[PDB]
């Protein structure tokens, strides 16, 4: 089997991407943030605290004839940005672009944090990291990809995120028309439950490529590109007037600047992020200082190849018995 669904930025800055997902019988369609950095499929629901719902579409399990309460199961998740949610668990039928899993664990939110309430466009998350990170207790549950894998034509899914435009998540096949050149595959460590890999280096604009190993995760659920402080300083030093702002919480730059590109290595291959992808717009409405799309990972503990990096590439999440990651230009 295969599945294919269009993913759309939630706003004019590509802060996140939403993909429609069918849940239950009859179908309830919710727009979920597909997150290769986490492993819980959770949704705003009829059970979510009323004051914490502000325009999201809710899943109502009592209206789904295939929904079954997973007895005694609860979940609670905290993300690296400080956001969180928690609730109880149903199993139900879940479909993405024609690909169907019966008995998928659907985590129904009873509580969500302020950042979720304030994003009216995100009805929940669909985790695509490794199932070892799933938070359901006392019986851990599998991701949608993990459940579908054996039925897929190939045990893979691909992320083709757009810059200021729609893109595609495919399950079970590689669309060879969706990229240029070849896909370079690189090793993955699953030891922390992430799609963790090692970039072979970087360049800033037309500068000399620096060969250096950068361990990090491929994370569609994170907006920006978080890299070591030395790398990030080298990038922003090329932008006249850019500086690290402690009040703002990262590097900012004059909105009048044209940004240099940033290149990252995948084996001997190179992925070029156009400079415009690195502009995240005014720090506050009407300001002429703009927030940078490449930020230091120093306070995080891990480097994150978030959407800024991934949307420059066609990305293969290969769930073969030894998982690997593939990157192609596009
Ligand atoms: N990395 C997962 C994630 C995704 C979205 C959000 C937000 F911004 F919608 F709350 C937070 C955390």
- 197 and 135 in a single domain? The answer is no
Residues 6+ apart with CB under 8 A from 266: 184, 186, 199, 200, 327
Residue 295's alpha-carbon distances to 88, 210, 268, 278, 327, in angstroms, are 35, 18, 24, 10, 22
Same domain (yes/no): 130, 25 = yes
Task: Record the resolution, in angstroms.
Answer: 1.4
Q: Do 205 and 109 have their domain in common?
A: no
Q: Which range of residues forms the domain containing residue 154?
A: 5-174
Residue 314, CA atoms < 13 Å, CB-side half-sphere: 18
Q: Do 309 and 210 share a structural domain? A: yes
- Token digits of residue 105: 């664990």
Q: Which position among 33, 35, 40, 92 bears the catalytic label?
A: 35
Task: Report the separation in Å between the CA atom of 180 and the middle of ligand 1, taken as the mean of its atom positions.
Answer: 31
The neighbour count for residue 297, using CB atoms within 10 Å, is 18
Same domain, 153 and 181: no
CA distance 232 to 225: 10
Residues 319 and 198 in one domain: yes
Assess whether 198 and 140 both reside in one domain.
no
Q: Provide the 3-class DSSP secondary structure of residue 270.
A: strand
Q: Which pair of structure tokens corresponds to residue 24?
A: 């239950």
Partner residues linked to 89 by β-bridges = 107
The CA–CA distances, whole Å, from 91 to 59, 87, 143, 275 equal 12, 14, 12, 43
Please choose, from the candidates 134, 126, 140, 144, the residue with its C-alpha nearest in 3D space to the C-alpha of residue 193: 134
How far, in Å, CA of 5 to CA of 125, rounded?
15
> 235 in helix, strand or coil?
helix
Among candidate residues 45, 85, 199, 261, the one labeled active-site is 199
Q: Catalytic: 199? A: yes
Question: Looking at 174, 203, 237, which one is the last position of a domain?
Answer: 174
Whether residue 169 is found in the same domain as residue 197? no
Which tokens sit at 12? 């004019």
Using the 3D structure, point to which of 157, 174, 191 is the last residue of a domain. Answer: 174
Counting the structural domains of the chain, the total is 2
Looking at ligand 1, which residue's alpha carbon is closest to its atom 1? Answer: 221
User: Which letter does DSSP use for residue 133 in this model?
Assistant: G
Tokens of 235: 């990038």
Q: Tell the residue number behind the tokens 């199932």, with chain if given.
A: 131
Chosen domain end from 174, 200, 231: 174
Residues 159 and 227 in one domain: no
- Pair 242, 97 in one domain: no
Strand, coil or helix: 118: helix
Do 181 and 49 lie in a common domain? no
* Residues 6+ away with beta carbon under 8 Å from 247: none
Dihedral of the alpha carbons of 49, 136, 322, 156, in degrees to the nearest 10: -40
Same domain? 12 vs 106: yes
Around ligand 1, the residues with Cβ closer than 6 Å are 16, 33, 35, 37-38, 79, 81, 83, 115-116, 119, 122, 221-222
């Amino acid at each position: 089997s295969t599945g294919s669904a269009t993913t759309t930025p939630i706003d004019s800055l590509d802060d996140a991407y939403i993909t429609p997902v069918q849940i239950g019988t009859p179908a309830q369609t919710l727009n979920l943030d597909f997150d290769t950095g986490s492993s819980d499929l959770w949704v705003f629901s009829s059970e979510t605290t009323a004051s914490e719902v502000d325009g999201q579409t809710i899943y109502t399990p009592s209206k789904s004839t295939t929904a079954k309460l997973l007895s005694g199961a609860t979940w609670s998740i905290s993300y690296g940005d400080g956001s969180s949610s928690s609730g109880d668990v149903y199993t139900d039928t879940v479909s993405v672009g024609g690909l169907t899993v019966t008995g998928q664990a659907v985590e129904s939110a009873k509580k969500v944090s302020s950042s979720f309430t304030e994003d009216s466009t995100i009805d929940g998350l669909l985790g695509l990291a490794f199932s070892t990170l799933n938070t359901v207790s006392p019986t851990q549950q599998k991701t949608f990809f993990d459940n579908a894998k054996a039925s897929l034509d190939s045990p893979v899914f691909t992320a083709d995120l757009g810059y200021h435009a729609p893109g595609t998540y495919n399950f079970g096949f590689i669309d060879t028309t969706a990229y240029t050149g070849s896909i370079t595959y690189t090793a993955v460590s699953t030891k922390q439950g992430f799609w963790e890999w090692t970039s072979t280096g970087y360049a800033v604009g037309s500068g000399t490529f620096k060969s250096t190993s950068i361990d990090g995760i491929a994370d569609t659920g994170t907006t920006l590109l978080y890299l070591p402080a030395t790398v990030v300083s080298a990038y922003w030093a090329q932008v006249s007037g850019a500086k690290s702002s402690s009040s703002v919480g990262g590097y900012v730059f004059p909105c009048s600047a044209t940004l240099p590109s940033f290149t990252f290595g995948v084996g001997s291959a190179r992925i070029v992020i156009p400079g415009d992808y690195i502009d995240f717009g005014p720090i506050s409405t009407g300001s002429s200082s703009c927030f940078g799309g490449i930020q230091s990972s120093a306070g995080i503990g891990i480097n994150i190849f978030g959407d800024v990096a991934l949307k420059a590439a066609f990305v293969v999440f290969n769930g073969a018995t030894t998982p690997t990651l593939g990157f192609a230009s596009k």
